């Protein structure tokens, strides 16, 4: 912790004297004998998170279901739509289809 000299207000440093450890100024004679226990606790943050991930419900919390893919026609699906390329005047879609775990991903 920062502690400052009552005289000149520079920063104190800890050093050792002939009877005690002392807080001492570098620029004036002031010293302070450490007579008793003094402490300073930082209290850092623990890495609490355990975090399992990748569950199927965490995958299918998106709108689409019971639609039709051009590959395997299954109802349990995971869709996507894009437009951010205006060279493509047509729309852009991508689909995931996982009822039979077939796993297509096309345009």
């Amino acid at each position: 912790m920062l502690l400052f000299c009552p005289g000149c207000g520079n920063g104190l440093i800890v050093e050792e004297g002939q009877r005690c450890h002392r807080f001492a100024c570098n620029t004036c004679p002031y010293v302070h004998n450490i007579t008793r226990k003094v402490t300073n606790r930082k209290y850092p943050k623990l890495k609490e998170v355990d975090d399992v991930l990748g569950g199927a419900a965490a995958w299918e919390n998106v709108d689409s279901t019971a639609e039709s893919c051009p590959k395997c026609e299954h109802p349990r699906a995971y869709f996507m739509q894009l437009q951010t390329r205006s060279a493509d005047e047509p729309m852009t879609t991508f689909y995931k289809c996982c009822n039979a775990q077939c796993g297509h991903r096309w345009r």
Binding site: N61, V62, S64, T84, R85, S86, A87, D88, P90
Partner: protein, 116 residues
């Protein structure tokens, strides 16, 4: 998910009542031009406007635009367009559609120099 689920539900209903002979429906079925997203987007509901795969980032301090309250995480405050292109976009919604659209031009430009 709730918003995207609402969009999916509003799209199915429109297709169910669209009569055969609706020209837009034909071009989607035969695959010559368009898709069921495009039909649902101009009749029923334009989607969540997404920039780099996420809802609209805060371009002011803790809010997207000054028209919404700070820290608000509501649908319309972050780019959900509840209007279709038939009903016409609101000042606020139009700006969101344009922004997601502009990521289109930005990506195409970047790819060309590198891919060459």
């Amino acid at each position: 998910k709730e918003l995207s689920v609402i969009r999916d539900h509003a799209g199915s209903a429109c297709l169910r009542e669209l009569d055969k002979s609706n020209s837009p429906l034909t071009m989607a079925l035969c695959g010559s031009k368009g898709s069921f997203i495009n039909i649902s987007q101009m009749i029923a509901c334009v989607g969540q406007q997404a920039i780099s795969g996420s809802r609209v980032p805060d371009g002011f301090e803790n809010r997207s635009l000054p028209h919404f309250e700070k820290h608000s995480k509501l649908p319309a405050a972050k780019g959900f367009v509840a209007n279709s292109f038939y009903s016409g976009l609101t000042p606020t919604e139009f700006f969101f559609h344009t922004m997601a659209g502009r990521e289109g031009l930005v990506d195409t430009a970047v790819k060309t120099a590198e891919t060459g």
